[PDB]
C-alpha cells in the first residue's frame, strides 16, 4: 500500500537535500504529508525513530523542514535509548538552532515515560546541566532535570552553579523547584523555605496532546507531624569514613522509596525511622513495622509526643478551649482506628484516662472516650478499681439510660479484649490469680446491672444490654 | 434499630479484619523466608579487599589519564614569545590545587594566551579570582 512509500521517503531522507529540482521538494513535502497521516492514524515504529531524529538534528534540510519533523514525531512504540544518546550528541555538536532545540527539549519532556531504559539517560546528567547557561532553554531544561534528578547527582559545585544562576536572574519558579528538590536531596548544603501548591512549572499542553490521548487509547488494550526523613544530625561530626561503607555493606533503606507493600516486604528488617514518630500514626506501612518492634526509645518518644498532644488538645482538662471541637474528635477517631490495629493500646491513653476522668461530665466525647476505655491493659481489679471504676460508677448511677447502655457495651468490649489476651498466655502471677480479677469484674458489673434495674424501674431496653453481656 | 446498626458495624469490621489478616499472613511468610535465607548463609580478607579496590581504582585512573592525554594531544596541538600547550596549563592548575589547598590561585602569564584561558573559563573548568582577574584557580570538583 503506502508502507513502501514510507520506506522510500525515509530512504530519500537518508540521501540528503536537493539543489536544483525544487519540485522534488514539493514531492518530499507530499512525503511529509504521508508521514504525518500515518503518524496520526497509527503512529511510527521504533526502527525509523533514530534515523528521523538524527536527520532532524543534523541540520541538512533547514529549519523550515526540521520544525515539523519534531512535531510529527509520534512514538507509537517504545523509544530506544541509543537514539536519545545520538540526539544528545548531535545537540552537543552545535549545528542546531534555538527553536529546534526548544522543540526537542519539549518533546523529550513530554515523551519521557515512553522510553524503556532510563539509566543511560541519567548517565548524561552533566550534558543536560551544562545547558542551563542559556536563558532561552532554562525552563525546559529545569523541568527535565526535575525528573532526571537522583541522589548521586546532587553535588556542591552544581549547588554553587544554581546559586549563582539565581543571583544573576532572581526568583524564577523553574529554579525554585529545582532548588527545593536539591535541598530535599541534600539538606546539609542548601536551606530553602518556599512560600505558597502554586504552579511552578508551566502546565502548557504540548503539540502532541492529541497524540498523547492517541497513545493512551492505543495502550488501553497540623496536629500530626508531617512525614520527613531522619534528622541530618546523624554522622554530623565525622573525621573519616566508617569501615562499613568502605566495604560496601548493607547500610539502610531510604524512607522516600517506601511506597508500596512489596517494597516493605523486601526491606522489613532494615528501615529508616522518621524524625518525628507522630507521623507514623497515619501510615499503614509504618504501622505494619511498629506492630512488632518493642523498642524502648521509639516507645518513649511516641509516649511523650502523644501525652503532650492529648494534654494540650483536650477540651475540659487544664484549659477551657472549646475552639478545638471536631478536631479532638477526629484525632481520637484516628487513635482508635490505629489502636484497633496492633491489638493493643498505648500508655499515653491510659494516663490521659486516669488524669481527665474525675473532671469528665459524660457528654463531650462519650463515644471516643468509652471506646478508649475498652483498650486498657490487663491488671488486677483491686488496683485499677479506685482509679477508673469508682468514677465510672459515680457517673453511672446519676446519668440517663443511654449512658448506662454505653458503659455496659464498653465493659463487654473490655471483658472480650481481656479474655482474648489471656487465652494466648496459657499456650506459652499464675492463672489462679488471673481468674480472680475477671471474676471480680463480672461480680462488679452484675451488681451494677442489678442496681440499674432497680433504679430505672425495670426497663427492657437495659435488660437487653444486660443479657447481651451475659451472652458473652 | 440498635440491632440493625450493630449488624452493619459487625459486617464492616469483619471485612476490615479479613483484609488485615491477609496482609499480616503475607508479612509473616516473607519474614520467615528471609530469616531462613539468612540462617542458611580475620583481617586478611579485609586487607585483600582493600588491595583489590586500590588496584581497580589505580587501573581506572591510569586508563582515564592516558585517554585524556591522547585526546588533548590529538585535538589541541601546539598553537603556531612562545606559548605552552593546554595540557601543561591543566597540569599546573591541578598541581597547585592539590599541593596548596588554601591558596590554589595562579597568576596569568604570557604563555597562557587569551584563547585557552577563555575556553577554560567558559567551560567552567577555571575561575577568576574575585578581586583581581590576573589570578585563576581550578574548580574543586571533589568537594
Amino acid at each position: 500500500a503506502e508502507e513502501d512509500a514510507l520506506q522510500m521517503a525515509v530512504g530519500y531522507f537518508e540521501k540528503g537535500p536537493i539543489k536544483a529540482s525544487q519540485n522534488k521538494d514539493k514531492t518530499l513535502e507530499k512525503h511529509l504529508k504521508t508521514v504525518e497521516n500515518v503518524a496520526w492514524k497509527n503512529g511510527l515504529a521504533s526502527e525509523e525513530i533514530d534515523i528521523l531524529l538524527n536527520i532532524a538534528l543534523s541540520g541538512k534540510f533547514g529549519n523550515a523542514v526540521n520544525t515539523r519533523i519534531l512535531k510529527c514525531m509520534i512514538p507509537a512504540t517504545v523509544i530506544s535509548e541509543d537514539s536519545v544518546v545520538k540526539a544528545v550528541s548531535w545537540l552537543c555538536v552545535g549545528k542546531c538552532s534555538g527553536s529546534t532545540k526548544v522543540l526537542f527539549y519539549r518533546w523529550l519532556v513530554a515523551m519521557f515515560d515512553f522510553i524503556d531504559r532510563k539509566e543511560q539517560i541519567n548517565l548524561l546528567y552533566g550534558f543536560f546541566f551544562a545547558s542551563l547557561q542559556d536563558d532561552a532553554l532554562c525552563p525546559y531544561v529545569c523541568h527535565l532535570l526535575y525528573l532526571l534528578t537522583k541522589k548521586e547527582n546532587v553535588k556542591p559545585f552544581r549547588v554553587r552553579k544554581l546559586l549563582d544562576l539565581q543571583a544573576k536572574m532572581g526568583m524564577q519558579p523553574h529554579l525554585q523547584a529545582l532548588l527545593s528538590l536539591y535541598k530535599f536531596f541534600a539538606p546539609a548544603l542548601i536551606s530553602v523555605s518556599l512560600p505558597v501548591k502554586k504552579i511552578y512549572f508551566k502546565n502548557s499542553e504540548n503539540l502532541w496532546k492529541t497524540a498523547l490521548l492517541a497513545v493512551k487509547q492505543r495502550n488501553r488494550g497540623s496536629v500530626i507531624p508531617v512525614l520527613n526523613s531522619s534528622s541530618y544530625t546523624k554522622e554530623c561530626g565525622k573525621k573519616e569514613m566508617s569501615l562499613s561503607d568502605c566495604l560496601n555493606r548493607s547500610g539502610s533503606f531510604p524512607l522516600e522509596q517506601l511506597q508500596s507493600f512489596p517494597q516493605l516486604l523486601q526491606n522489613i528488617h532494615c528501615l529508616e525511622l522518621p524524625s518525628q514518630m507522630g507521623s507514623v500514626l497515619n501510615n499503614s506501612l509504618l504501622l505494619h513495622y511498629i506492630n512488632c518492634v518493642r523498642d524502648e526509645p521509639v516507645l518513649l518518644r511516641f509516649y511523650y509526643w502523644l501525652s503532650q498532644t492529648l494534654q494540650e488538645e483536650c477540651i475540659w482538662y487544664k484549659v477551657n478551649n472549646y475552639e478545638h471541637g471536631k478536631e479532638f474528635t477526629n484525632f481520637l477517631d484516628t487513635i482508635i482506628r490505629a489502636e484497633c490495629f496492633l491489638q493493643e493500646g498505648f500508655y499515653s491513653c491510659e494516663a490521659f484516662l486516669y488524669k481527665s476522668l474525675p473532671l469528665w461530665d459524660g457528654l463531650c466525647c462519650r463515644s471516643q472516650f468509652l471506646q478508649l476505655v475498652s483498650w486498657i491493659p490487663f491488671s488486677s481489679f483491686s488496683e485499677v478499681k479506685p482509679l477508673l471504676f469508682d468514677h465510672l460508677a459515680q457517673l453511672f448511677f446519676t446519668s440517663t439510660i443511654y449512658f448506662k447502655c454505653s458503659v455496659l457495651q464498653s465493659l463487654k468490649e473490655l471483658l472480650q479484649n481481656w479474655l482474648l489476651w489471656l487465652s494466648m498466655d496459657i499456650h506459652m502471677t499464675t492463672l489462679g490469680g488471673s481468674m480472680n480479677s475477671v471474676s471480680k469484674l463480672i461480680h462488679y458489673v452484675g451488681w451494677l446491672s442489678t442496681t440499674a434495674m432497680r433504679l430505672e424501674s425495670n426497663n427492657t431496653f437495659l435488660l437487653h444490654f444486660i443479657l447481651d453481656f451475659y451472652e458473652k | 434499630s440498635t440491632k440493625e446498626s450493630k449488624n452493619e458495624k459487625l459486617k464492616e469490621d469483619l471485612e476490615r479484619e479479613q483484609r488485615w489478616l491477609d496482609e499480616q499472613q503475607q508479612i509473616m511468610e516473607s519474614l520467615n523466608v528471609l530469616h531462613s535465607e539468612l540462617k542458611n548463609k580475620s583481617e586478611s580478607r579485609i586487607f585483600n579487599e582493600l588491595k583489590t579496590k586500590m588496584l581497580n581504582i589505580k587501573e581506572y585512573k591510569e586508563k582515564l589519564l592516558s585517554t585524556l592525554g591522547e585526546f588533548l594531544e590529538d585535538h589541541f596541538p601546539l598553537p603556531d614569545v612562545n606559548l605552552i600547550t593546554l595540557h601543561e596549563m591543566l597540569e599546573i592548575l591541578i598541581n597547585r590545587l592539590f599541593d596548596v589547598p588554601h591558596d590554589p590561585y595562579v597568576k596569568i602569564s604570557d604563555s597562557f594566551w587569551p584563547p585557552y584561558v577563555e575556553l577554560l573559563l567558559r567551560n567552567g573548568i577555571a575561575l577568576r579570582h574575585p578581586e583581581d582577574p590576573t589570578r585563576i584557580r581550578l574548580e574543586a570538583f571533589h568537594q
Binding site: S406 | T2, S5, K6, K9
Partner: peptide
Amino acid sequence: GVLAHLERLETQ
C-alpha cells in the same frame, strides 16, 4: 456504630 446510635437517640 452502637455508641453513635445511642448518642443520636439521646440528642433527639
